[PDB]
Design a protein around this ligand. Structure first.
Ligand SMILES: Nc1nc2c(ncn2[C@@H]2O[C@H](COP(=O)(O)OP(=O)(O)OP(=O)(O)O)[C@@H](O)[C@H]2O)c(=O)[nH]1
Ligand SMILES: Nc1nc2c(ncn2[C@@H]2O[C@H](COP(=O)(O)OP(=O)(O)OP(=O)(O)O)[C@@H](O)[C@H]2O)c(=O)[nH]1
Ligand SMILES: Nc1nc2c(ncn2[C@@H]2O[C@H](COP(=O)(O)OP(=O)(O)OP(=O)(O)O)[C@@H](O)[C@H]2O)c(=O)[nH]1
Lengths: 496, 496, 496
């Protein structure tokens, strides 16, 4: 049970060794092979660590009149490409080391998806549940009152974001503080953060984003025969066994979108148990009980399945919530062709090997749960371009989108409308639905997928280049580094 | 052999005289004809000079331990419309006067193409070749360390750029300095400069931009019969003799794009000699030797042509590199209907007259080599909107771009698909190539051409308005001034 | 052998317990004894920790072309009273914990002497000796390039300073960086740091300051009979045995000033050995060999004394350099009435008890080595008032300083100068020496002593108030906290 930090650090190291072999070969500087090799080697010593790490102490007053001190950490991995991004996490497992990872992680996560942001993250040694709303509203707006004094929060330095144990309220609190302490005139203050509610500049779609980011991520591969062949599987979703573990968020919004395109999901894993219905389960009906029961168990159309989800005979498996759920004890026990890994580090390094030995494909946590980052990026622009996307264009496009058809109509009626036969060219129900449903919801759904699309394709290439086969986890950490490295190299690596 | 400055100044003067005749007539102020004429007249005394010109001195330390002082000049023509733009030039021909021109030039260049920027330029009395990479990296990052202390470098004051003797490295160096001296949080620091590499916010297409800007510039005229008639020529490129002088950059990337649309280029001029093949030459094969030989001479499929390119019997002639190449001695000797003038001041004032007497059309250096500016402008936005263009839209457009076709299909199958005959409407190879090739490369190629398109059209008008016929050089300097003047007039000309 | 951190933390804790007993009694708020006691108690939980602690990573390039990463720490104890102060230390013993102490220390050190500054400190995991001057000049100016991006260096946030392993050069380097990265116009940039050379705004006297701060600190007690009586000693210095350990700096400049006022120093401790001359030793003659020999040993007029300085039969003992030199093994072995503790933590907690049991007075490291801080404060003003002290006044005072005497002369000659007898009132050699020697050297020497004077007096009071007798170390940590606490209380303790 290594520390998730040590997991990460262990990976990057491996990727570096892989990269260097050629990265030195494809370096176009006039130097000695040795000389230049000592350039790259150290650069891969430079980015790995996290530049700035700050430790705090808060004199907050409780509701009972008492005082207590609070520790808070912010980690800003690398300045190679600002601004920097990172969510906040209120918990008691926090620690300096636990952070540097996730910042040094999100960075690599962002690069895979071609995002400018730089990785960061913060945390606080605290358990929210023991504290009220007011207290938390006293904590937060003081937290981001300090960091702002110290240049770790600004629309072009560092951008907080949500995470488990947080929500819009928390964000909403922050942004106000900033505007009342720093911006005071600065227009870009509305971009201080992300994940805001919709009324201030948020997004129609954030909540389900991640779940989607999983989906289009899987799609870019399942529809890829080059790997179907390897796993003896078939392209498409119309005939496949799908399951989930970590119901709730990302487990769900994916399950639903998943159900949409011909999927047949079978099971559900929950902190309290499981279910099973080889006939396929409606996510909708489950959405109900999650609110009408606070649990999955008791679902009429599924048996309370004994055992872990992982041991289910299926095609896909989605460890959306549990961390380190896959071990050498289960890796052989799993029954699946593919794994998703929505959550971060649901899988152990040892297992990955076992899968590669079982010819089991997987997906890296980076790629999938990225969409929860991607969307933010978009939301970080809405607050900069100070508009909802498209509102200058929807109707214009619309107009053109049916002046054309008219042109077609006339063009045809002109040629073989000889007798005058009219061709009432019209939209399609769907296409008409898009039109009247014109809204950011459609844009984002697009600028998200395209992203996840392009990224995957780069990865496949990256895999082939290095003959990694199905060992994508590395391949991603690979494709990331090359981008990162390439950046830091072309930045005048340092002015000292 | 006047100084390129004196050339410029000589032109503007001429344009003013031409403009005033009507600019006073079309001025809508309640004044006396005389009174108002004394308004315009002086305004054309105001813009002409360059407001700010700074002279520097650098205590740099060589690699040998020695010190030496270095002089550096920055010229910011006019504040009438900030920000201001201007590249850098490392040479020993530099001088205050040599600058004011090019700044006072780029301004007028920018206006022709409807660009906000204001003209500037910098230079340094130095010969790079005698200095290392490190030294230059010591020079530059100190150069832009001073100017920043003094408000001549900022994403909304003044924007450096490349030029001969410079490259991405130089830029890349600068931007880092700025972020480490001024921005420190400012998001727009990524726009401090332009011409950056691609990894930081550069562009897919810069290198060939200029060459293209030449092309679409020629196209907007060759396809214009109104001038074909005058020169007894034909519209199109499918039947014309093309040549070049100044092979390398802009000479090349144009030659290639030129070759694409039915051109037949015949010759090449190079600092070391020339070639000739009335059968037409593949730029590609030339691209090879330029790298496999560092020269054109020795090209199998062309004779080493004796004489200057200018004296070749052709339809187009492109003095892409040489300066002041066209004199009264050659002006009559030239064999051509049109000239391009990619470079700046390849042609002499005296010659222009001779051409007008020989009924020879030409093109102003302003218009053509503008694209090397235009593109930058775009690149200056990529770093402000903090995105690669379109990524929010490509797939959305894509979707719509084939939901429509479906609509057509259904619409037709509905009317005279009576028996059920299906119409498998599909894209075209080309159109499908666009789609999968979706990228900035296509956007920029567009927002460039359109620009060069609209501009030309304004010029034609401007020519007709003033009955200049083929004497475009003036006409441009004309169309520019009116815009400029119009700006400075509507700006509350001055608050003093 | 506890960590110097743990030493410190152990002290403050003790002081708090002592303070609270009355601090709650002298709190003038309308509350319940319990209620208010829960106010103070926690406040003494708040100040103790250090608010901001930053960890860094530097991509520096060596002279050999290689790269290496460097870690650097800055600790800004408390914002209760900005700006904050702290020197820098280049070593390899550095660590986060090792810092928080010294920052949380200097704070309390500053308060004793009624200084606004807030404690901070920085360090770097590095050994200078293995690196050149250039490298260090590459390290430093990058170090303070980051911290400035992050608001840990500024004339009104945080003020670096020298320390062992540093010197004026290091400072001089920094200040330039700042002016070239942040100030750019800010007048107060000349105050970014302290310890500067004299040519930029430094001070005539810094080097010997500390040594002096020791002296006047001892004087305020030795001349105090109230404690002479306790130790059975005599006031004055004219008859006392003085010694030293840690020759070099502070050991020396004190020894000299010490020699001036009737002292008779006997021995010297050095890293390499010792000497002894009951006849008294001229510091001057020693100054010579320290430069003519790099050592004390071989001094003609002193025997190479076997044993540690501590075991010498004397009246005063000055552990100026060695850390943790005094242990339970030596505490009883020491032969002395008083200890100085110029260095930080030369003495162990256990020993202090033993001394109190041996009726041995001591002095806290805080008080004495403070002068090295005090002076800086002054130097931090020279760079703000942008003048050398007094230059507006010396001659004015001078004038008045002898218009008076004239008045006396005339006044006397008027009354009983009846016959006309003239009274040539004149200055004294000394007083005339002051005049012609008018310079900062005299001011600082004053504003230093007065400080150390007033402080001590507060401490005596503080001791009596709490009946600590000779256990001053606490008493200081006591007098400090009350000031600190009092500050943080009257600051609207927090706006959350
Ligand atoms: N679909 C769905 N949405 C939910 C659920 N719970 C909360 N939501 C929120 O409701 C919103 C519904 O999104 P819509 O914009 O109405 O429809 P959509 O974006 O096209 O797709 P869905 O989000 O799946 O409905 C989502 O953005 C979620 O934030 C749920 O169980 N199912
Ligand atoms: N075409 C071409 N590109 C070159 C040449 N030399 C360097 N390049 C670079 O290669 C890039 C090729 O551009 P692409 O994006 O691949 O293709 P394109 O932009 O549609 O058109 P081309 O630039 O002419 O290839 C250009 O942007 C140049 O910067 C050359 O000789 N020919
Ligand atoms: N006195 C003294 N000064 C030294 C010695 N070594 C270096 N110095 C420097 O020389 C300066 C001499 O100070 P001065 O201003 O000339 O005289 P002062 O300040 O009245 O008293 P001193 O510093 O003891 O000489 C001090 O500030 C030190 O920085 C030394 O061994 N003895």
């Amino acid at each position: 049970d290594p520390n998730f930090f040590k997991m990460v650090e262990g990976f990057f190291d491996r990727g570096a060794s892989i990269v260097e072999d050629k990265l030195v070969e494809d370096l176009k500087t006039r130097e000695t092979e040795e000389q230049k090799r000592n350039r790259v080697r150290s650069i891969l010593r430079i980015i790995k660590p996290c530049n700035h790490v700050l430790s705090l102490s808060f004199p907050i007053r409780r509701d009972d009149g008492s005082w207590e001190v609070i520790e808070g950490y912010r980690a800003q991995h690398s300045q190679h490409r600002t601004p920097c991004k990172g969510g906040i996490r209120y918990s008691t497992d926090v620690s300096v080391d636990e952070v540097k990872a996730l910042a040094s992680l999100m960075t690599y996560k962002c690069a895979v998806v071609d995002v400018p942001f730089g990785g960061a993250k913060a945390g606080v040694k605290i358990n929210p549940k023991n504290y009220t709303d007011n207290e938390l509203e006293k904590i937060t707006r003081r937290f981001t009152m300090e960091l702002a004094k110290k240049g770790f929060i600004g629309p072009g330095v560092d951008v907080p974001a949500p995470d488990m144990s947080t929500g819009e309220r928390e964000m909403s609190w922050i942004a106000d503080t900033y505007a009342s302490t720093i911006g005071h005139y600065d227009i870009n203050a509305h971009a201080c953060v992300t994940g805001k509610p919709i009324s201030q500049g948020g997004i129609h779609g954030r909540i389900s984003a991640t779940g989607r980011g999983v989906f289009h991520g899987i799609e870019n591969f399942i529809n890829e025969a080059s790997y179907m062949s390897i796993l003896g599987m078939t392209p498409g979703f119309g005939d496949k066994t799908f399951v989930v573990q970590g119901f709730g968020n990302v487990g769900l919004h994916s399950m639903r979108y998943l159900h949409r395109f011909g999927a047949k999901c079978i099971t559900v894993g929950e902190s309290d148990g499981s279910i099973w219905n080889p006939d396929g389960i409606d996510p909708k009906e489950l959405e109900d009980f999650k609110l009408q029961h606070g649990t999955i168990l008791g679902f009429p159309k599924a048996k309370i399945y004994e055992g872990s989800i992982l041991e289910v005979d299926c095609d896909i498996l989605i460890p959306a919530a549990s961390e380190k759920q896959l071990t050498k004890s289960n890796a052989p026990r799993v029954k699946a062709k593919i794994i998703a890994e929505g959550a971060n580090g649901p899988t152990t390094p040892e297992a990955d090997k076992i899968f590669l030995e079982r010819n089991i494909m997987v997906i890296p946590d980076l790629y999938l749960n990225a969409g929860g980052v991607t969307v933010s990026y978009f939301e970080w622009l809405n607050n900069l371009n100070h508009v909802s996307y498209g509102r200058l264009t929807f109707k214009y496009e619309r107009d053109s989108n049916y002046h054309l058809l008219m042109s077609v109509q006339e063009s045809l009626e002109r040629k073989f409308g000889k007798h005058g036969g009219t061709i009432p060219i019209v939209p399609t129900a769907e296409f008409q639905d898009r039109i009247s449903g014109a809204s950011e919801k459609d844009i984002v759904h697009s600028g998200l997928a395209y992203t996840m699309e392009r990224s995957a394709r780069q990865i496949m290439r990256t895999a082939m280049k290095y003959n990694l086969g199905l060992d994508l986890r590395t391949a991603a950490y690979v494709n990331a580094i090359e981008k990162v490295f390439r950046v830091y190299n072309e930045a005048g690596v340092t002015f000292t």
